Amino acid sequence: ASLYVGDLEPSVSEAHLYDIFSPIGSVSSIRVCRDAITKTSLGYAYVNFNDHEAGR
Amino acid sequence: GKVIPSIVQDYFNLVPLNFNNKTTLFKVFSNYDGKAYVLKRLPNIDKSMNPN
């Protein structure tokens, strides 16, 4: 139903995680975390799923 | 008479030069160094959203 994805580079966009995790299952959404001031990514992200099987 | 005072951001005694870099050309004696420097304002932009 979701996933945390850590150990990422700030140049890794959401499309890299999409090319990894959409072969796993139905990606509902992806968001890469940034700082609210620097507009620089924080090295991790989140991929919301919808099913438990694709999450496992 | 500048609305900017002397002591701004590790520098002081801000006195200007000729108009249009009627400012953005400031003679400044330094606090951290103690050395005559020039400053330019860029007094028109206001957005620098990425410190990156």
Curated annotation (Swiss-Prot), chain A:
Subcellular location field: Cytoplasm; Nucleus
Protein origin, superkingdom: Eukaryota
Transmembrane regions listed in the UniProt entry: none
Domain RRM: 1-56
Listed result of changing residue 42 to A: In PAB1-14; fails to bind poly(U), but not poly(A) RNA
Quaternary structure annotation from Swiss-Prot or TrEMBL: Binds to poly(A) mRNA to form a periodic structure with a packing density of one molecule per 25 adenylate residues. Interacts with the nuclear export factor CRM1 and with the importin SXM1. Interacts with RNA15, a component of the cleavage factor IA (CFIA) complex. Interacts with translation initiation factor eIF4G (TIF4631 or TIF4632) and release factor eRF3 (SUP35). Interacts with the PAB-dependent poly(A)-nuclease (PAN) complex regulatory subunit PAN3. Interacts with ARF1, DCP1, PBP1, the Hsp70 chaperone SSA1, and TPA1. Interacts with PAT1 in an RNA-dependent manner.
Domains as described in the record: RNA recognition motifs (RRMs) 1 and 2 bind specifically to the poly(A) tail, whereas RRMs 3 and 4 bind non-specifically to polypyrimidine RNAs and may serve to bind to a different part of the messenger or to other RNAs. RRM 2 also mediates interaction with eIF-4G.
Family from the record: Belongs to the polyadenylate-binding protein type-1 family.
Note: Present with 198000 molecules/cell in log phase SD medium.
Purpose: Binds the poly(A) tail of mRNA. Appears to be an important mediator of the multiple roles of the poly(A) tail in mRNA biogenesis, stability and translation. In the nucleus, interacts with the nuclear cleavage factor IA (CFIA), which is required for both mRNA cleavage and polyadenylation. Is also required for efficient mRNA export to the cytoplasm. Acts in concert with a poly(A)-specific nuclease (PAN) to affect poly(A) tail shortening, which may occur concomitantly with either nucleocytoplasmic mRNA transport or translational initiation.
Name of protein: Polyadenylate-binding protein, cytoplasmic and nuclear
The organism of origin for this protein: Saccharomyces cerevisiae (strain ATCC 204508 / S288c)
Gene label: PAB1
Residue window of the full protein shown: 38 to 93 of 577
Swiss-Prot record, chain B:
Residues noted as binding ATP in the record, renumbered to the chain: 40
Origin superkingdom: Eukaryota
Post-translational modification: Phosphorylated by the cyclin-CDK complex PCL1-PHO85.
Localization, UniProt: Cytoplasm
Assembly and interaction partners: Homodimer. Forms a heterotrimer with a catalytic subunit PAN2 to form the poly(A)-nuclease (PAN) deadenylation complex. Interacts (via PAM-2 motif) with poly(A)-binding protein PAB1 (via PABC domain), conferring substrate specificity of the enzyme complex.
Protein family: Belongs to the protein kinase superfamily. PAN3 family.
Protein purpose: Regulatory subunit of the poly(A)-nuclease (PAN) deadenylation complex, one of two cytoplasmic mRNA deadenylases involved in mRNA turnover. PAN specifically shortens poly(A) tails of RNA and the activity is stimulated by poly(A)-binding protein PAB1. PAN deadenylation is followed by rapid degradation of the shortened mRNA tails by the CCR4-NOT complex. Deadenylated mRNAs are then degraded by two alternative mechanisms, namely exosome-mediated 3'-5' exonucleolytic degradation, or deadenylation-dependent mRNA decaping by DCP1-DCP2 and subsequent 5'-3' exonucleolytic degradation by XRN1.
Annotated domain remarks: The N-terminal zinc finger binds to poly(A) RNA.
Remaining remarks: Present with 1600 molecules/cell in log phase SD medium.
Name of the protein in its database record: PAN2-PAN3 deadenylation complex subunit PAN3
Organism from which the protein derives: Saccharomyces cerevisiae (strain ATCC 204508 / S288c)
Origin organism lineage: Eukaryota, Fungi, Dikarya, Ascomycota, Saccharomycotina
Full-protein positions shown: 281 to 337 of 679
